[PDB]
Design an enzyme around this catalytic site. Structure first.
Site, PDB file in Angstrom:
ATOM      1  CG  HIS A  56      58.159 100.696 -36.836  1.00  0.00           C
ATOM      2  ND1 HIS A  56      57.269 100.068 -37.680  1.00  0.00           N
ATOM      3  CD2 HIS A  56      58.101 100.021 -35.662  1.00  0.00           C
ATOM      4  CE1 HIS A  56      56.695  99.054 -37.048  1.00  0.00           C
ATOM      5  NE2 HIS A  56      57.179  99.007 -35.817  1.00  0.00           N
ATOM      6  CD  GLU A  57      60.780 100.471 -32.556  1.00  0.00           C
ATOM      7  OE1 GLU A  57      60.435  99.712 -33.484  1.00  0.00           O
ATOM      8  OE2 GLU A  57      60.361 100.326 -31.402  1.00  0.00           O
TER       9      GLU A  57
ATOM     10  CG  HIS B 291      55.429 101.122 -31.714  1.00  0.00           C
ATOM     11  ND1 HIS B 291      54.188 100.601 -32.017  1.00  0.00           N
ATOM     12  CD2 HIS B 291      56.331 100.368 -32.386  1.00  0.00           C
ATOM     13  CE1 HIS B 291      54.331  99.611 -32.881  1.00  0.00           C
ATOM     14  NE2 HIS B 291      55.622  99.439 -33.107  1.00  0.00           N
TER      15      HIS B 291
ATOM     16  CG  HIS C 141      52.879  96.652 -35.589  1.00  0.00           C
ATOM     17  ND1 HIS C 141      53.295  95.544 -34.881  1.00  0.00           N
ATOM     18  CD2 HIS C 141      53.908  97.536 -35.546  1.00  0.00           C
ATOM     19  CE1 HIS C 141      54.529  95.740 -34.445  1.00  0.00           C
ATOM     20  NE2 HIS C 141      54.935  96.930 -34.857  1.00  0.00           N
TER      21      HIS C 141
HETATM   22  C1  LIG Z   1      60.547  99.952 -39.806  1.00  0.00           C
HETATM   23  O1  LIG Z   1      60.580  99.761 -38.383  1.00  0.00           O
HETATM   24  C2  LIG Z   1      60.590  98.521 -37.783  1.00  0.00           C
HETATM   25  C3  LIG Z   1      60.231  97.348 -38.467  1.00  0.00           C
HETATM   26  C4  LIG Z   1      60.293  96.109 -37.807  1.00  0.00           C
HETATM   27  C5  LIG Z   1      60.689  96.042 -36.452  1.00  0.00           C
HETATM   28  S1  LIG Z   1      60.810  94.641 -35.670  1.00  0.00           S
HETATM   29  O2  LIG Z   1      61.828  94.796 -34.669  1.00  0.00           O
HETATM   30  O3  LIG Z   1      61.250  93.655 -36.618  1.00  0.00           O
HETATM   31  N1  LIG Z   1      59.497  94.223 -34.975  1.00  0.00           N
HETATM   32  C6  LIG Z   1      58.485  93.514 -35.758  1.00  0.00           C
HETATM   33  C7  LIG Z   1      57.691  92.592 -34.835  1.00  0.00           C
HETATM   34  O4  LIG Z   1      56.750  93.397 -34.131  1.00  0.00           O
HETATM   35  C8  LIG Z   1      55.702  92.673 -33.489  1.00  0.00           C
HETATM   36  O5  LIG Z   1      54.525  92.745 -34.297  1.00  0.00           O
HETATM   37  C9  LIG Z   1      53.402  92.037 -33.747  1.00  0.00           C
HETATM   38  C10 LIG Z   1      52.267  92.076 -34.776  1.00  0.00           C
HETATM   39  O6  LIG Z   1      51.651  93.371 -34.833  1.00  0.00           O
HETATM   40  C11 LIG Z   1      53.017  92.580 -32.368  1.00  0.00           C
HETATM   41  O7  LIG Z   1      52.085  91.669 -31.820  1.00  0.00           O
HETATM   42  C12 LIG Z   1      54.242  92.687 -31.444  1.00  0.00           C
HETATM   43  O8  LIG Z   1      53.962  93.436 -30.254  1.00  0.00           O
HETATM   44  C13 LIG Z   1      55.421  93.338 -32.155  1.00  0.00           C
HETATM   45  O9  LIG Z   1      56.607  93.218 -31.384  1.00  0.00           O
HETATM   46  C14 LIG Z   1      59.272  94.586 -33.571  1.00  0.00           C
HETATM   47  C15 LIG Z   1      58.586  95.930 -33.576  1.00  0.00           C
HETATM   48  O10 LIG Z   1      57.585  96.126 -34.268  1.00  0.00           O
HETATM   49  N2  LIG Z   1      59.125  96.885 -32.818  1.00  0.00           N
HETATM   50  O11 LIG Z   1      58.526  98.130 -32.906  1.00  0.00           O
HETATM   51  C16 LIG Z   1      61.039  97.224 -35.783  1.00  0.00           C
HETATM   52  C17 LIG Z   1      60.997  98.450 -36.447  1.00  0.00           C
HETATM   53 ZN   LIG Z   2      56.657  97.943 -34.172  1.00  0.00          ZN
END
Ligand SMILES: COc1ccc(S(=O)(=O)N(CCO[C@@H]2O[C@H](CO)[C@@H](O)[C@H](O)[C@H]2O)CC(=O)NO)cc1
Ligand SMILES: [Zn+2]
Ligand SMILES: [Ca+2]
Ligand SMILES: [Ca+2]
Ligand SMILES: [Ca+2]
Ligand SMILES: [Zn+2]
Length: 158
Positions: A113-114, A117, A123
């Site tokens: 996921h990272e 980005h 997203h």
């Molecule tokens: C499966 O891989 C992941 C799943 C969840 C997360 S997570 O750590 O739980 N996570 C979710 C929250 O993200 C938010 O989403 C919002 C809606 O689009 C955006 O406005 C904002 O910028 C964004 O930070 C932060 C993330 O996506 N990091 O990349 C991290 C990785």
């Molecule tokens: Zn993300």
């Protein structure tokens, strides 16, 4: 928005979570890069020294950017879109417990996921997509990009 304008991309692992064996960190990150190179013209190489395109960092709390981490749970990681400097870098919250499996937070799945980005993806609203903003563990041995993930990345590359 921004994309890498070159085919050979480098990454560097800045430091290693104590939650995992070193070789397992290396493998999870490698496999996560491979997910994206499978479906684009990109090639990824790990460098041990010097400036990489994508710096992989483990850190907790305030860690030198505007994206302070929040302790265990909540935000698991964040990454910057393509560009110079911190562009492309992927940061993982050390307050999580990183693993190779279904326990804690799976490093591979998160890094897939990272890196999305780091390559320019935003997203997705489709819960099936890896770029959906909610972490849900799926078996990593048979993991696959959703059609949505594939059309998104292929809209940027290839
Ligand atoms: C499966 O891989 C992941 C799943 C969840 C997360 S997570 O750590 O739980 N996570 C979710 C929250 O993200 C938010 O989403 C919002 C809606 O689009 C955006 O406005 C904002 O910028 C964004 O930070 C932060 C993330 O996506 N990091 O990349 C991290 C990785
Ligand atoms: Zn993300
Ligand atoms: Ca957190
Ligand atoms: Ca960078
Ligand atoms: Ca940890
Ligand atoms: Zn950060």
């Amino acid at each position: 928005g921004p994309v890498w304008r070159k085919h050979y991309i480098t990454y560097r692992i800045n430091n290693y979570t104590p939650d995992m064996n070193r070789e397992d960190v290396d493998y999870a990150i490698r496999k996560a890069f491979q997910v994206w190179s499978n479906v684009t013209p990109l090639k990824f190489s790990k460098i041990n020294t010097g400036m990489a395109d994508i710096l992989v960092v483990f850190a907790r709390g305030a860690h030198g950017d505007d994206h302070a981490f929040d302790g265990k749970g909540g935000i698991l990681a964040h990454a910057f879109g393509p560009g110079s400097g911190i562009g492309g870098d992927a940061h993982f919250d050390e307050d999580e417990f990183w693993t190779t499996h279904s326990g804690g937070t799976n490093l591979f799945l998160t890094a897939v996921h990272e890196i999305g980005h780091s390559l320019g993806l935003g997203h997705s609203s489709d819960p099936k997509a890896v770029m959906f903003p909610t972490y849900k563990y799926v078996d990593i041995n048979t993991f696959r990009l959703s059609a949505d993930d594939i059309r998104g990345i292929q809209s940027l590359y290839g």
